[PDB]
Structures are given as structure tokens and as C-alpha cells.
DNA sequence: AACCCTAACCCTAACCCTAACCCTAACCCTAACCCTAACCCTAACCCTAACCCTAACCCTAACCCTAACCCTAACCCTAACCCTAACCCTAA
DNA sequence: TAGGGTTAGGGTTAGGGTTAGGGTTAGGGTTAGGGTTAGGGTTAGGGTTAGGGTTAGGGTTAGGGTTAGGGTTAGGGTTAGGGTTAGGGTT
């Protein structure tokens, strides 16, 4: 059957060139090569933030399922407003 | 005589930062050569010491008693006391592993 | 059986004659060998291994009697020290005789 | 051709083994050359220490009336004498409890 | 997809995940890093380099307030 | 050289009100001056009879600085520069 | 009716004669089996752990923690308190030198 | 596949009951409410540090099964020397 | 009277070397050279001291980089044996690599 | 004796990779010395100088 | 003295057993050497002792202000029964 | 995987132990003058070492035999369960 449950290897699934394309829509033309592990470290903190804000309205509603409209309310609060993937 | 009669607790916070500031030795050098030398007696006659050996054990029994004065001073204050007695120091010994 | 096993030491047989010399009708179970055997294996690394670092400094290349008496003056206490620095001399006399 | 083939703790009269004892000296790499004299003194120190750990044992079981020693008496014997108690002073034995002491403000006193 | 599933782990077990919820969040992260690089990029320009580097990275995140 | 009581009253109340204020104590009372001369003569006795015993191994008569900071190193203690 | 309530600390000074003369391990062996397997898998994943393993972690562990208690009931008896509280426990570790 | 739950005991099984059994062995007559989640604070430290010496020890001889003479041989660099448990 | 000179032997050189990369414009005083040239001789008697009793438990007789790596993974602490076991991982590849 | 190329300069470290064999020889640590550990044991002394000199 | 707990057994019945028995493996006598801890003038230096001084440091009072201690209540919180019935043992 | 018995897990309750406050008195603190001893120097002479050739006995070491120590195993000698009786007071 399925006997294994996700380790914590996740947080370096994003490889090194994701990071290199990232950031090549951002300007950025040499990057040097001690940023690859910050950029896992300013991603790690944020999908935490958001995450926990996301579970807290879940279970008021006493539910089981994280939708779309959770992560949507979670993300007005912190600072951002996406617009499009909700209601 | 309308003086600087400092209050009792002026002229020890003065002090405390003055020695903590410092790398010289506070005993005093003669009176202890001969500490050194009247527990040597016994052990065997005649023990001639060298130079730096009679420092080397001053710089080891005066960075020992400036250990022990830190944890008796963290004890007296777990009573609500400011004046080390000697019943701290005797407190410090134990738990540490020393004298039992 | 076809295994071959190395098999392994143990100075469990010796602590069981010295138990009988002391006292003759008392017996030891075998979780208290367990605690006695280590015991004979760790004053024999503290006893032999003082003897290593005290050869070195004085530049000398071989662990004789002498280095195994400073070794017990050192890593042993006060009167079970001089009861058995006494104690070996002794055997070590009657060896040289045979 | 040889004749008698006397064994060395026999001649030293010493009940340890002085045999087993000069191979681990030469072959744990403490010094290149072990003196004959040598194993001789380790086997006599190492033999009176054993036994003052057994006798001491022996009598506290008695006292239980128990005819064995097993680990609770040899913690009561090492942990009472004072020498014994400052060599093994960091050592647990296992399944040892504590000695019994109970300190008098807790004890009530009235 | 894991690395979502893996921090929901601490804050409770049993959590089911809509397609959806994935989606949101590989389009805000996503945006939180492109934005993080430019403002690092203008900070590097300002020293005469012309690289990012680990320090860039935390005067960008002083001065718009997050770290503290 | 002596075998007076000069060598526990060496350490006299000024030095041993000076070396504790190089550790926080802000007031000291009148007993501990005494049982500070007591627990400096122990230690010293341990350090010093460690430093014989290395002292006879190889015949010398004089006590050398290498000989107190191996004694030192056995107890816990380590000291690093009076000697090598 | 009889209550037979001894007084508050009395069925305790029984409890403490008692538990000091006997040896057996006082934490069950099936949930502290699982505290050493959580805090192995950091370290690697896939260890396998004989029995022997978790029976001498047991036996320190409880050694450890017997020691830590009775050093902080030392420091209690010092101030005039007759009961152990989370402040004591820091100044036994910050004295033995662990911090 | 996988047991429901994967909190791998979290410093669980110490329960105010066993607290209260390895205290009265110690001496202390009166606990206080708070020791509890201290006492799950320093085991917490120590079977930690024991471990990460244990698994170092087995990772050099390649095997993936921790022995005993490894917890042994771990014990005695921090300090205590078990005697006899593994031997 | 002539030569009848010991050459006494430390690694003293090799530490005014290192203050002449890391923090040119700067020179050590006599004691400092002391209680320099007296650490360098106790991590090399700590990691060489794990390394032959590793060595023994394992029953084998030669100690590889893998046993003075091993040492470095346990003496040294966090942030220390990490920014340790790579600068060796590197210095030693050059050596195998370049000829 | 071709020519002479000291054993540190070839791995590039500073603290010698000569004097560390003679020691851990002479110190009768262990029968076979090796040559992976000379090299690797003159680096993980040299990173430790260059934290407590900077 | 409400009426609660402490101390003889005694059957009960597995693990320390003496063999006992091979037998496998590690010591011992018997032959080789080498090498070093003994040996010695010497010549060198460095520790000990003695002498002088003198000026910062200890010593011994006086005066008075805090801090250590002992009560005083009192009031929160940690103790001691009680149905569970959940979970850890115990095989297998 | 059963299954079963007991361990932990909830309630109340009353006592007792922190804890805050309010006086009381010796005890360190803080200055101020006397009376040194603990530092420096310089000589000098004895007191312990640093190499250095040189034996000779104590090791090592590599051949034999062979002895002693290390596994396996029925059946008895403690040794705990297992109930009564005892026995301590203990609220």
C-alpha cells in the first residue's frame, strides 16, 4: 500500500534553477551563489503565515477541507488581496 | 562638614566595575609563596619550586574563588537576600559536586 | 553449529573464585556479573591509561612496574590507595623469586 | 621439548589472569613495549578492588537475609563507604533505586 | 503540492486539501518572491555591484517593516 | 620555608573582599571571610600532592610549571599559557 | 460512615518510604518506545532500534531525572518553602553547569 | 498504510502520575502545578542528545540498526557510564 | 659548549600566518602566541583521541579521513562542525583531483 | 628529489600537512596513519584559528 | 478508638546451576637478538638566601543607616476518595 | 489480534502554606589616622641539571606442544506469589 507519509525534504524541492527564474523576472542578472538557501528560508516563513490563518477559519466552520475562500480570506488580512482564484 | 558622605551602596557599585574591568592578580604575591610551601612540607621534604610554578597556582586559586563567588551570589539572591552568608557557599558546593 | 562463532572474553570465571575465597556459601546472579565484569574492564582503561601519558612526558618507550604505581597513587583515593600500592609490591616479590 | 609448564598467575599466586592481561596492554596501542613486570602489578591491583567490592556486598545481603547479591546490595555497598563512593562517584548501576534518606522539614516534626 | 502538506502537518492532522487552495497559493507566493528580487536588485545597484547577494536580501526586509 | 598560621592569614580580608567583588557581591558578611580561607587550603592540597607525584616519577627535586598544568588538566580544570 | 482522610501530606511521607526501597522503572515501556522513535527520526529515517536500545535509554533517563529532583528539593528547603516550583529547577541547572 | 496519527508520541506517556512516581523518589513532598511541562522540557534535551551521539556511532559501521553497545559507548563522552545494560 | 642546542618545536609560524589573511594591519603579543600555540595542541589531541578508539570499537586498524571526520560530526558543536566538515571535503579533493 | 613542492602547498592550506603525520605516527594513536588524514586534520584546525584570530 | 494498617508463613515451582564434556583456541618453553636504561664528568644556570628601603596597603576604631528576622493574618491552591473504562500489557 | 484488568483521568474540599505587610535591632558600610611589610633592586654561591659514550640485561619474536577457557544442558534450591494469620496506630 502507500506506507510512507511526506518528510521534510519538501522545503528543497524548490531547486536551484526555480530560484534562478524567479528572480530573472525580477531584473536580477548575476546572482550569487549563498542566495539559494535564503530564498528558502523568506519562502518557508510566509507559506507558515498564511497557513495557520487558513487552518483557524477552517475549524470554526468545524470542517475537515481547506477551500479556496479560506486561503482568499486568509490573505486580506496578512496585507495582500489576490483577485481571481475565489469569490 | 557638608562633605560626599556616600550612602551605604555608592561606593560598592563603583568597585564592582572597576575590578570587573581588569586582567591583574589581587593577592599579593610574597604571602602566598608561602601558602604554597607549608602544604609542600608535608608531602616531601626539600620540594624546591620554580618560578612559574608558584604562578600557575595563583592564576588556578584565584579563578576558582572567583567561581565559586558567582554561584553563591546567584543562591543568596533565590532567597531574597543581597549579602552572601555562609550558608550559601556551602549550598553551591553540593549541587556542583565538591564536598559531597 | 555451522556458524563458527568468534565467541567473546569475559572475566567472569575469575570473579566467581575470588567471590568463594571471601565469603564461602553466598552466590551471584547473572545481571550482577553483568555489573561486575564492567567494572574489571573500566579500572583496567582508567589504571592502564594514566601509565600511556606518563610514559610520553618523560620521553621514556616502555610501560614498566614502576608507571603502573604512579598510576595508582594517582586515580585512587587515600586508604584504598595505600592497601593496594602495599598489595601488589608483594606479588610482584614473589614472582621475581620463581 | 620444555618439562614443568607452570602458568604465571600460579607462580604469582594471584587469581586474576596475568596471561589475558599482557595481550590487551600490547595490542590497544597504550605504549610499544610492555615490560613482564608490569601485567604482575595490574592483575594484583585490580584483584583487591574486586574483592572489596564483593565482601562489602555479601554483608548487606545478609542483613536482607537474601543468599545472593544481585544489583540493589551492590549499590547499598558502593554507595556507603566513602573511598568507594569517590572512584564510582558518577557510575548508576543498573536497576539500583537510592539509598533511603528523607530530609527532617519535610519529615513532620510534631 | 508537499511542501503545503507538509507545514499542515503541526497545525492539525486530517486536513484535506482542495485543488483550488493549491492553486491560490502558488499564485501569491509566487508574487511575495518575484517582488522580494526587484527590491533586493535596487539595493544592489545602490552599493556599485551589479549582483544580489545573502545581505541585500535583509535591508530589503528592515526597511519595508516585516522582520522588526 | 615556614610552618606557622602567616600562610592562611596571607590571604587577608582586603584580598578576599576584592577577589569576590570581581564576581557581583555587593555586601559580604563577617563569616565568610572564614570559610574562604578554608575551601583555598583544600583545593591547594589537591593541586600541590598531584604535582609531587609526577614530580618523584622522574627523580627531579624541583616542582615545574608543566608538572602543575598537567596536575590541573586531570581534575576538570584546564589552564592554557603558563606552559605548553 | 468512616472518611478517613489523613490529614493533607501524610499519605505522601508513606509513598516516598515505600518508592524509595524498591527498584522497578516508573514510565511504561509502550509510550516511552515512541518518544525515543519521534526524536530518531530527525537524524535519519529508516533505524531500526533493538530492544536492548530503548531499555538503557530508560534506565539513564530515569537516573537523570531522578538526580534533577533531588537537587532542586535542596534549593526549596533554602528559602523556607517546603515544595519544589518551575523557578527552583533553572538555579539547579544553572549552578551544575549544564544551562 | 499509515497509523492515522504521526505525532510519534509528542513527549507524551509522562503523565502527572509518572512525574509524581519519579519525584517522591527523589524526596520532594508538595509538587508545584507548573513542573509538569518543565519536566517535559529537560527529558525533551537529553533523549536528544544522547541520540544524536547514538546515530553518529551506527552511520560509521554502515548498519542501520542502533545496538545497545552504541547507547553504551554515547553515555559515557557526555558523562554518566551505564554499567552492565548493554556491557 | 658548541651546537649542544635542542630545537625546541611549535606551531607558531602557522599562526602569524593566518592573522596575515583574515586581518592584515594587525600583530599578536608574546602571550597571545602562548595561549594560541596552546589550543591548536588541544583540538589536536580531542580528534585524535575519538579517532583511535572509533577505530578499535569498529576492529580495524588504520584511521581514514572517515574516522577524523567522524570526530569533527561529535566534538565540535552546531555551526562549527558544519563550516568544518565542507573546508575538509574541499581540501582534500584537491588533493586526489590535482596533481 | 627531482624538486621540492612542500605536501601543504599542493592541497593549498596554510598549517602543515607535514609535521600532523610525524604526530599522530609518534604518538602511537593508531598502527596505519593513512594519508586521507594528515590532510583532512590540518583544515579542521586551520577553520578553528581562523575564528578565535578574527 | 473513629476503626484504620504491618508481619508471620509456605507452598511454589524457573533459573542458577555443577558437572561434564568435548574441543577450540590461546598460552608457554625454547631457541634467536638488540638496545637502552643504566653509567659519568662537566659546566652551566638558576634557585635560594641575604640585605635595604620605603611608600602604598593593611589595621583599628567610631557613627549610623539598612537589611534580616519575626511576628501578624489570610486566602488562594494543592492535597486526598471515586466511578470509570481506556489503554497497555500478555500471549501467540 | 483479542481481551482484560488496571492505570490514568476526571470531579470535589478543606486545610495549610505562601505571601504581603509592619515594626526592631544588630550589622555592614563609610571615612580617618597610625604603623608597617611587601614589594622592588643587587651579589654570590651552592644546588640541581644536559648531553654523551657505553655496557648488558631486558625486552621481542618466531617456532613448537598443550592447557585452560568457552560454549550447551537436566533437575534441584531458592524464591517469589499467595493466601491466611500476624503486626504497626492514625485519621
Redesign the pocket.
Given at each position: 500500500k502507500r506506507h510512507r507519509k511526506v518528510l521534510r525534504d519538501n522545503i528543497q524541492g524548490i531547486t536551484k534553477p526555480a530560484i534562478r527564474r524567479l528572480a530573472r523576472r525580477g531584473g536580477v542578472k548575476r546572482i550569487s551563489g549563498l542566495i539559494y538557501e535564503e530564498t528558502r528560508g523568506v519562502l518557508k516563513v510566509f507559506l507558515e503565515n498564511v497557513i495557520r490563518d487558513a487552518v483557524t477559519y477552517t475549524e470554526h466552520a468545524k470542517r475537515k477541507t481547506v477551500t479556496a475562500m479560506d486561503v482568499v480570506y486568509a490573505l486580506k488580512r496578512q496585507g495582500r488581496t489576490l483577485y481571481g482564484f475565489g469569490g | 562638614?557638608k562633605?560626599?558622605?556616600?550612602?551605604?551602596?555608592?561606593?560598592?557599585l563603583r568597585?564592582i566595575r572597576r575590578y570587573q574591568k581588569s586582567t591583574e592578580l589581587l593577592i599579593?604575591?610574597?604571602?602566598?609563596q608561602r601558602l604554597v610551601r607549608e602544604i609542600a612540607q608535608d608531602f616531601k621534604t626539600?620540594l624546591?619550586?620554580?618560578?612559574?610554578a608558584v604562578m600557575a597556582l595563583q592564576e588556578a586559586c584565584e579563578a576558582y574563588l572567583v567561581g565559586l563567588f558567582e554561584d553563591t551570589n546567584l543562591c543568596?539572591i533565590h532567597?531574597?537576600?543581597?549579602?552572601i552568608?555562609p550558608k550559601d557557599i556551602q549550598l553551591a558546593r553540593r549541587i556542583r559536586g565538591e564536598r559531597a | 553449529?555451522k556458524?563458527?562463532?568468534?565467541?567473546?572474553?569475559?572475566?567472569?570465571?575469575?570473579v566467581?573464585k575470588v567471590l568463594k575465597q571471601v565469603h564461602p556459601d553466598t552466590?551471584?546472579?547473572?545481571?550482577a556479573m553483568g555489573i561486575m565484569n564492567s567494572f574489571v574492564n573500566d579500572i583496567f582503561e582508567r589504571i592502564a591509561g594514566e601509565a600511556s601519558r606518563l610514559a610520553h612526558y618523560n620521553?621514556?618507550?616502555?610501560i614498566?612496574?614502576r608507571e603502573i604505581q604512579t598510576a595508582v597513587r594517582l586515580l585512587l583515593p587515600g586508604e584504598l590507595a595505600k592497601h593496594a600500592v602495599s598489595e601488589g609490591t608483594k606479588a610482584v616479590t614473589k614472582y621475581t623469586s620463581a | 621439548?620444555?618439562?614443568?609448564?607452570?602458568?604465571?598467575?600460579?607462580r604469582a599466586g594471584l587469581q586474576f589472569?596475568?596471561?589475558?592481561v599482557?595481550?590487551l596492554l600490547?595490542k590497544g596501542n597504550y605504549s610499544?613495549?610492555?615490560?613482564?613486570?608490569?601485567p604482575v602489578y595490574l592483575a594484583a591491583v585490580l584483584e583487591y578492588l574486586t574483592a572489596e567490592i564483593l565482601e562489602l556486598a555479601g554483608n548487606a545481603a545478609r542483613d536482607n537475609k537474601?543468599?545472593?547479591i544481585?544489583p540493589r546490595h551492590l549499590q547499598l555497598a558502593i554507595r556507603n563507604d566513602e573511598e568507594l563512593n569517590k572512584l564510582l562517584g558518577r557510575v548508576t548501576i543498573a536497576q539500583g533505586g537510592v539509598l533511603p534518606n528523607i530530609q527532617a522539614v519535610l519529615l513532620?516534626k510534631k
Open positions: - | 562638614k562633605p560626599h558622605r556616600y550612602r551605604p551602596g555608592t561606593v560598592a568597585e599579593r604575591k610574597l604571602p602566598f626539600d624546591r619550586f620554580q618560578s612559574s543568596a532567597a531574597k537576600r543581597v549579602t552568608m | 553449529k556458524r563458527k562463532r568468534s565467541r567473546k572474553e569475559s572475566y567472569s570465571v575469575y566467581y552466590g551471584i546472579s547473572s545481571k620521553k621514556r618507550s616502555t614498566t612496574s | 621439548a620444555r618439562a614443568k609448564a607452570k602458568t604465571r598467575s600460579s589472569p596475568v596471561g589475558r599482557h595481550r600490547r610499544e613495549r610492555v615490560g613482564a613486570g608490569a537474601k543468599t545472593r544481585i513532620p
